[PDB]
């Protein structure tokens, strides 16, 4: 493969195909399917990280959409990135405005 040759889990082949076929440019370098597959791999790790955490925190062995949402909205940097994305079955973070609380 090449996932091997770059220590990646993410299909370095698949990616090189998709760049060429998805009409981004005439020609496509050798490093880029690797650079990108990596960045894709990197980021899917950070999510899987904090969601899993969240599934532990929420006492489950399996990650459901909520755990993703919690991971995402609680992370300041990830939340920005997915600033315009609604995640199916995410729900919302619990947040109740002060002045609404009892006295």
């Amino acid at each position: 493969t090449r996932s091997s040759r770059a220590g990646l889990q993410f299909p370095v082949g698949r990616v090189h195909r998709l760049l060429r076929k998805g009409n981004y440019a005439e020609r496509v370098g050798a490093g880029a399917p690797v650079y990108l597959a990596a960045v894709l791999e990197y980021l899917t790790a950070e999510i899987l990280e904090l969601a899993g955490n969240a599934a532990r925190d929420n006492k489950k062995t399996r990650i459901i959409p909520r755990h993703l949402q919690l991971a995402v909205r609680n992370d300041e940097e990830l939340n920005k990135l997915l600033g315009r994305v609604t995640i199916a079955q995410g729900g919302v973070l619990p947040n109740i405005q002060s002045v609404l609380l009892p006295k």
């Binding site: 959409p65 315009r84 994305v85 609604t86 995640i87 199916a88 079955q89 729900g91 919302v92 947040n95 109740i96 405005q97 609404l100």
Partner: protein
């Protein structure tokens, strides 16, 4: 039909919304709002179906529509 969007349903959404107290006129306002929303999304959706020469609006037409409109949704074949 539209009035099928029940007061209690609208109430729940506002609760998940963080809202404590709701005026009566809201409910109807919500409806126009929701209507406008679907219209635009379904207009774009259908346009995709019309262009795909299909009598069956898919999830991907929807998904493509939401993208177009900057309301991207995950979990239906991104």
């Amino acid at each position: 039909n539209i009035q099928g969007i029940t007061k209690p349903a609208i109430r729940r959404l506002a609760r998940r919304g963080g809202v404590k107290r709701i005026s009566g006129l809201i409910y109807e306002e919500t409806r126009g709002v929701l209507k406008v929303f679907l219209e635009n999304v379904i207009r774009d959706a259908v346009t995709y179906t019309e262009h795909a020469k299909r009598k069956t609006v898919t999830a991907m037409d929807v998904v493509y529509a939401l993208k177009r409109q900057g309301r991207t949704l995950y979990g239906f074949g991104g």
